[PDB]
Design an enzyme around this catalytic site. Structure first.
Site, PDB file in Angstrom:
ATOM      1  N   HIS A 121       0.814  -1.222   0.000  1.00 35.48           N
ATOM      2  CA  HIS A 121       0.000   0.000   0.000  1.00 35.48           C
ATOM      3  C   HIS A 121       0.845   1.267   0.000  1.00 35.48           C
ATOM      4  O   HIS A 121       1.873   1.346   0.683  1.00 35.48           O
ATOM      5  CB  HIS A 121      -0.928  -0.026   1.233  1.00 35.48           C
ATOM      6  CG  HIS A 121      -1.498   1.314   1.598  1.00 35.48           C
ATOM      7  ND1 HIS A 121      -2.579   1.869   0.942  1.00 35.48           N
ATOM      8  CD2 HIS A 121      -1.157   2.192   2.576  1.00 35.48           C
ATOM      9  CE1 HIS A 121      -2.870   3.042   1.495  1.00 35.48           C
ATOM     10  NE2 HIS A 121      -2.008   3.268   2.472  1.00 35.48           N
ATOM     11  N   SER A 163       0.701   5.504   0.468  1.00 38.60           N
ATOM     12  CA  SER A 163      -0.068   6.734   0.803  1.00 38.60           C
ATOM     13  C   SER A 163       0.861   7.696   1.522  1.00 38.60           C
ATOM     14  O   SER A 163       1.986   7.348   1.747  1.00 38.60           O
ATOM     15  CB  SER A 163      -1.345   6.446   1.600  1.00 38.60           C
ATOM     16  OG  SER A 163      -1.034   5.737   2.799  1.00 38.60           O
ATOM     17  N   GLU A 201      -2.957   0.523  -3.941  1.00 40.04           N
ATOM     18  CA  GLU A 201      -2.455  -0.758  -3.459  1.00 40.04           C
ATOM     19  C   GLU A 201      -2.120  -1.611  -4.654  1.00 40.04           C
ATOM     20  O   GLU A 201      -2.697  -1.395  -5.736  1.00 40.04           O
ATOM     21  CB  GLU A 201      -3.528  -1.486  -2.636  1.00 40.04           C
ATOM     22  CG  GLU A 201      -3.903  -0.831  -1.285  1.00 40.04           C
ATOM     23  CD  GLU A 201      -4.864   0.360  -1.417  1.00 40.04           C
ATOM     24  OE1 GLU A 201      -5.903   0.214  -2.105  1.00 40.04           O
ATOM     25  OE2 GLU A 201      -4.580   1.450  -0.811  1.00 40.04           O
TER      26      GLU A 201
END
Ligand SMILES: CCCCCCCCCCOCCOCCOCCOCCOCCO
Ligand SMILES: CCCCCCCCCCOCCOCCOCCOCCOCCO
Ligand SMILES: [Ca+2]
Length: 150
Positions: free
Chosen positions: A126, A128, A140
């Protein structure tokens, strides 16, 4: 060093393709009859199929990755987890507005390591920015990987 190739898909069902190089730490901890803790440095180049926010995009990432490798001979099961950093070629990737080009990489994985040093496994990664640049949609990649010593 080990080279790896991985094909996968995002949470939005777009394809990702990753080529990687790995460097074993050659240190272990918590070694018992069960297995040992170890790890590797992982460099990744990923292509992300376009979606409704960006056309195709690329990311370069680098992470320390911890591995717990269970005892075995011709096959050693392993699980892995790591945290790293990634730079994307734009702020919109697939269907996602990441907000920033720069992002953290959080990953987990599991697979089999063979006696000849090759390995196969699955990875979930993932990306971010921890809320540091809105809208921080994150993205993802859920992938199958193959790695070969070089
Ligand atoms: C079509 O392309 C999709 C192929 O990708 C395979 C998906 O692999 C599954 C991995 O997802 C779960 C990973 O969980 C990690 C376990 O620690
Ligand atoms: C960031 C570093 C990513 C390195 C990618 C590894 C490139 O080697 C693949 C070439 O394979 C030839 C087939
Ligand atoms: Ca995190």
């Amino acid at each position: 060093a080990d080279v790896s190739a991985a094909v996968g898909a995002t949470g939005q069902s777009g394809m990702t393709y990753r080529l990687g190089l790995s460097w074993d730490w050659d240190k272990s901890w918590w070694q018992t009859s069960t297995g040992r803790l170890t790890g590797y440095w992982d460099a990744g180049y990923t292509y992300w199929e376009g979606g409704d926010e960006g056309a195709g995009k690329h990311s370069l990432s680098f992470a320390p990755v911890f591995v717990y490798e269970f005892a075995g001979d011709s096959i050693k099961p392993f699980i892995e987890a790591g945290i790293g950093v990634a730079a994307f070629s734009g702020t919109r990737v697939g269907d996602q507005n990441l907000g920033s080009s720069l992002n953290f990489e959080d990953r987990i994985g599991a697979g089999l390591k063979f006696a000849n040093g090759q390995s196969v496994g699955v990875r979930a990664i993932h990306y971010s920015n921890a809320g540091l640049k809105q809208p921080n949609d994150g993205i993802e990649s859920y992938s199958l990987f193959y790695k070969i010593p070089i």
